[PDB]
Write an enzyme that holds these catalytic residues in place. Structure first.
Site, PDB file in Angstrom:
ATOM      1  N   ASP A   1      24.312 -26.913   4.896  1.00 22.12           N
ATOM      2  CA  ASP A   1      25.494 -26.645   4.082  1.00 22.12           C
ATOM      3  C   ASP A   1      26.399 -27.866   3.975  1.00 22.12           C
ATOM      4  O   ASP A   1      26.724 -28.321   2.873  1.00 22.12           O
ATOM      5  CB  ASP A   1      26.272 -25.469   4.664  1.00 22.12           C
TER       6      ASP A   1
ATOM      7  N   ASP B   1      27.000 -29.893   9.120  1.00 24.21           N
ATOM      8  CA  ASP B   1      26.344 -29.082  10.127  1.00 24.21           C
ATOM      9  C   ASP B   1      24.908 -28.825   9.688  1.00 24.21           C
ATOM     10  O   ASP B   1      24.417 -29.415   8.718  1.00 24.21           O
ATOM     11  CB  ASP B   1      27.118 -27.776  10.318  1.00 24.21           C
TER      12      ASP B   1
ATOM     13  N   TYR C   1      31.841 -18.528   5.483  1.00 22.82           N
ATOM     14  CA  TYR C   1      31.744 -18.223   4.053  1.00 22.82           C
ATOM     15  C   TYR C   1      31.922 -16.725   3.823  1.00 22.82           C
ATOM     16  O   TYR C   1      31.135 -16.069   3.138  1.00 22.82           O
ATOM     17  CB  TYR C   1      30.430 -18.749   3.482  1.00 22.82           C
TER      18      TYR C   1
ATOM     19  N   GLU D   1      35.592 -33.782   5.166  1.00 23.28           N
ATOM     20  CA  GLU D   1      34.516 -32.819   5.009  1.00 23.28           C
ATOM     21  C   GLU D   1      33.659 -33.201   3.807  1.00 23.28           C
ATOM     22  O   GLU D   1      34.148 -33.730   2.809  1.00 23.28           O
ATOM     23  CB  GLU D   1      35.086 -31.412   4.822  1.00 23.28           C
TER      24      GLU D   1
END
Ligand SMILES: [Ca+2]
Ligand SMILES: [Ca+2]
Length: 608
Positions: free
Chosen positions: A53, A56, A205, A421
């Site tokens: 994703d 990670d 999510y 991120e």
């Protein structure tokens, strides 16, 4: 102007770095290897493939499906420009990489695996993708009729329908497979109208918006792929269930298209399908709010021109909305004045991501790009620390980072999992935006661009000390700091070379020499008797074999294995360490001893 072709090239290549599973031999980098080959093994299925994703190694199917849909949307709208850029094949390969995975996650009509890996377990480990599955189990999570997940099944239905759309000319058999799975997943979602079983993605999510927007989203893509009006009718059926801007009757317009809210894209598609005023006005209301404003309200803008919807993935939001602006502005039914407003808005958001504010926010692109993206495999620590090494071993080309705050302030730090991120959904709409900017303004991609990096540290080698003691006693550490790519090794051995001239010339048999493992962190460690290497000079070596023990760049002190051993002749026999090749090397440089070469499954991989 900014080089949109190079940017597009890298934005698409980013997905190669996110690939999970057994990788194709046509990848364009030298630092990704096979990963998570056992995904699905806990349920007796092959659930390998797809994308990790973010920074990670969990496979979250809702954002993964959203991503695949957006990439296919880019292909659908800007195929010819993508072809000209030379990147259409790579993009299509990535779309199919994700969709092949969704298909494997759907073993029967009303059973869908929506996650591989556990967020809490996975995120504990700051290790590369090629090692994460050694450190913790990776459970497979599914929804079914008793534990449903309408949001993620509908989301995956849209991805497979969009995939079918863009593949139906080049691969009719694959598109027919995708569209069948799509309609089944749609029916599954529509039948259950519940996310009760969608629990493994909690806190990562969660779907706060629900599934009704996803049903219109998936229905519209299904209709576009194969023209089944049954699904267009269902798509319009759920429009009145969409979020509503509070205190009004308007379809909600003040957020943006993203993985947890797809009614913005659904409204755009339904507008182009039906030309109905409801959809055209809804999307224009949304794009107006993001540009010139609507009813005295307008999205926040930084002083340097970035549309700043939120502090979480702000560039993801601005570039995705810009993509929608590109699609609508290209449509013939878009009012002309705002077609110009929209496309001007799209270029400015594209240019902000690429460097208009003074620095690029695309890793490996442009002026002063981010260097510390929050990404485990690109950093590539060999000891489970964000801080070791203090710089990334790899360049995550094309990654759009989270971005700056409302004052354009930003700090490039690996620990900032907000500003730095990176994620699949961050680049998804970005790719389509850069496709349009390339179509309109050009910019040459880098010919035959490849992410083949120079190896900046020795990957596999022996560190050692020795002392003379009626023979020799060695204290060695066999390192695996591999990076290009990181990899697990369980067939490693090394050799210790000796000159036994003084020994055999004195009448002693090399097979009477004592060889013994004193201690080893590798429980399988063994040491051979002397093996003849040069009959002219009486050179022998002992093989220290650690096969059976994993050594890899991860946590738990697994990137090195200590072995202490001794080689001692029978009492009274002459012995001279000082003419022994490996002994000489140790005393010259014990840190990296090329004179104790390392073998993997009997093949030399380091040393002389
Ligand atoms: Ca939703
Ligand atoms: Ca000797």
């Amino acid at each position: 102007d900014y080089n949109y072709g190079e940017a597009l090239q890298k934005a698409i290549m980013f997905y190669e770095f996110q690939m999970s599973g057994k990788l194709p031999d046509n990848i364009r980098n030298n630092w990704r290897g096979d990963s998570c080959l056992g995904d699905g093994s806990d349920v007796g299925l092959d659930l390998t493939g797809g994308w990790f994703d973010a920074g990670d190694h969990v496979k979250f199917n809702l954002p993964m499906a959203y991503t695949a849909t957006m990439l296919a949307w880019a292909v659908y709208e800007y195929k010819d420009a993508l072809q000209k850029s030379g990147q259409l094949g790579y993009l299509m390969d990535q779309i199919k990489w994700a969709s092949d995975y969704f298909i494997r996650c759907h073993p029967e009509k009303y059973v869908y695996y929506y996650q591989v890996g556990n967020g809490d377990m996975d995120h504990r480990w700051w290790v590369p993708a090629e090692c994460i599955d050694v450190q913790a189990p990776r459970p497979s999570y599914k929804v079914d009729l008793s534990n449903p997940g309408s949001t993620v099944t509908a989301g995956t239905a849209a991805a497979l329908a969009a995939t079918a759309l863009v593949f139906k000319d080049t691969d009719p058999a694959y598109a027919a497979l995708c569209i069948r799975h799509a309609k089944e997943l749609f029916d599954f979602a529509e039948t259950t109208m519940s996310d009760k079983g969608y629990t493994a993605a909690l806190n990562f999510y969660t779907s706060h918006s629900g599934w009704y927007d996803e049903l219109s989203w998936a229905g519209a893509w299904i209709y576009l792929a194969d023209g089944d009006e049954t699904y267009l009718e269902k798509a319009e059926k759920y429009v009145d269930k969409w979020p509503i801007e509070s205190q009004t009757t308007y379809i909600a317009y003040s957020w943006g298209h993203c993985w947890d809210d797809v009614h913005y894209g659904a409204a755009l598609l339904l507008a182009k399908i039906t030309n109905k005023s409801l959809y055209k006005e809804a999307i224009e209301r949304h794009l107006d709010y993001w540009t010139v404003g609507f009813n005295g309200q307008r999205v926040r803008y930084t002083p340097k021109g970035l549309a700043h919807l939120t502090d979480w993935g702000v560039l993801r939001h601005a570039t995705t909305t810009a993509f929608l602006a590109c699609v609508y502005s290209d449509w013939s039914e878009c009012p002309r004045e705002k077609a110009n407003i929209y496309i001007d808005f799209a270029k400015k958001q594209a240019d902000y991501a690429l460097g208009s504010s003074g620095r690029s926010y695309v890793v490996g692109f442009g002026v002063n790009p981010p260097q510390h993206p929050h990404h485990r495999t690109a950093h590539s620590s060999w000891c489970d620390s964000q801080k070791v090494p203090e710089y990334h071993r790899h360049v995550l080309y094309g990654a759009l980072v989270g971005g700056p705050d409302a004052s354009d302030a930003y700090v490039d730090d690996i620990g900032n999992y907000v500003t730095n991120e990176v994620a699949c959904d961050y680049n998804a709409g970005f790719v389509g935006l850069l496709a349009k900017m390339y179509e309109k303004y050009g910019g040459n991609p880098i010919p035959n661009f490849m992410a083949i990096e120079e190896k900046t540290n020795e990957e596999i080698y022996v560190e050692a000390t020795a002392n003379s003691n009626n023979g020799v006693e060695l204290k060695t550490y066999l390192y695996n700091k591999s990076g290009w790519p990181a990899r697990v090794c369980d067939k490693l051995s090394f050799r210790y070379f000796m000159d036994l001239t003084e020994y055999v010339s004195a009448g002693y048999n090399p097979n009477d020499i004592t060889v013994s493992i004193i201690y080893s962190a590798a429980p399988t460690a063994k040491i051979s008797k002397p093996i003849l290497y040069d009959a002219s000079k009486n050179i022998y070596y002992c093989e220290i074999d650690l096969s059976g023990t994993k050594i890899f760049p991860g946590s738990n002190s697994d990137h090195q294995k200590e072995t202490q051993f001794r080689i001692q002749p029978p009492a009274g026999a002459p012995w001279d360490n000082t003419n022994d090749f490996s002994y000489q090397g140790i005393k010259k440089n014990g840190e990296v001893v090329k004179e104790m070469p390392v073998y993997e499954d009997g093949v030399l991989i380091f040393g002389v």
